[PDB]
Structures are given as C-alpha cells and as structure tokens.
Design an enzyme around this catalytic site. Sequence first.
Site, PDB file in Angstrom:
ATOM      1  N   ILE A 114       1.050  -1.219   0.015  1.00  0.00           N
ATOM      2  CA  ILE A 114      -0.036  -0.094  -0.245  1.00  0.00           C
ATOM      3  C   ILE A 114       0.876   1.172  -0.097  1.00  0.00           C
ATOM      4  O   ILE A 114       2.014   1.016   0.366  1.00  0.00           O
ATOM      5  CB  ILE A 114      -1.048  -0.037   1.380  1.00  0.00           C
ATOM      6  CG1 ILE A 114      -0.160   0.119   2.670  1.00  0.00           C
ATOM      7  CG2 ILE A 114      -1.848  -1.443   1.096  1.00  0.00           C
ATOM      8  CD1 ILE A 114      -1.218   0.161   3.721  1.00  0.00           C
ATOM      9  N   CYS A 115       0.212   2.389  -0.468  1.00  0.00           N
ATOM     10  CA  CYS A 115       1.142   3.651  -0.167  1.00  0.00           C
ATOM     11  C   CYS A 115       0.239   4.446   0.838  1.00  0.00           C
ATOM     12  O   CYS A 115      -0.778   5.110   0.340  1.00  0.00           O
ATOM     13  CB  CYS A 115       0.848   4.361  -1.864  1.00  0.00           C
ATOM     14  SG  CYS A 115       2.142   3.915  -2.948  1.00  0.00           S
TER      15      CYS A 115
END
Length: 158
Positions: A114-115
């Site tokens: 994820i970011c």
Amino acid sequence: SMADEATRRVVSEIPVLKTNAGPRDRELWVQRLKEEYQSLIRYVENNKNADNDWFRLESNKEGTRWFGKCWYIHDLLKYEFDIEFDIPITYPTTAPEIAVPELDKTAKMYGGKICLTDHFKPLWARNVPKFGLAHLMALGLGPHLAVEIPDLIQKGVI
C-alpha cells in the site's frame, strides 16, 4: 499540538513498546516480540469493546513474517482483505511495508504494498521505538482503509 493530541487520542489505550531491537538481536528481539504481542492483544481486546474488531494478525515462529485479515464496514456491508508484511532488519526504526496483495485495482499500491500518506513516516520517526505493529495498524492501515475502501467501492472495483 494538534498532530500530538490526535495520535494520543488514537493510541493512548495501546501498550507502549520499549525494546529497540530488530530480528537479528537475539534475547532483545525475543523481548521485543513479547512487547508486540502484549501491544497487539490489548488493542484487539479494546477493539471488541469498540465494536471495531477490524483485524487479526499472526506471525512465523521467529516473528519476522506476519499475515492476517482486516475488515472494513461501509453502509452496514463488511469487506475482508488478506494482509502481510515482513519485519525490516532495521525495525523498529524502520516501519514495515503492509501488503494487501488482492488489491494489486488501486493506484495507491506499488508488489501489493500500500501507499500510506507522506505524513506517516515522520509520525513513526518521532516515536521510535515506542510504536509497534499495533500502532502500524492503528495509525497506518486504519486511516488508509477509511479513504481507500470508500473510494474503491465508489469506483465499482469492490
């Protein structure tokens, strides 16, 4: 103050961790891991009272590989996601990279990782080594799901 007041409101009921040691560090790692499970299980039990029991985590014998599930509830409908992360050699200074592989359907994802907001890394750095996997869930994955899952539902990918 207001960054500080907010974090505290989210995590003050979670056990603070103490041992500054990563996977390679023998008895200090063994002690660290006991702090990780201590902090994880109190959070989870507190979450039952909050009717927000939103995640399960487990680890390999050495506590270097983690996997489990998170649950998001939108308009009374429950969504489940498989999650995993390894422990960096440099943990606990270096926060782990949480992966939701089955979403690899969103732009905020590089393999499955994820970011998070640019705001997370400084927040973690300001607290080393007091924050652990409980806090990564509380202050990282938690707010990510509250933005990402409503977006993906609206985009008809979930």
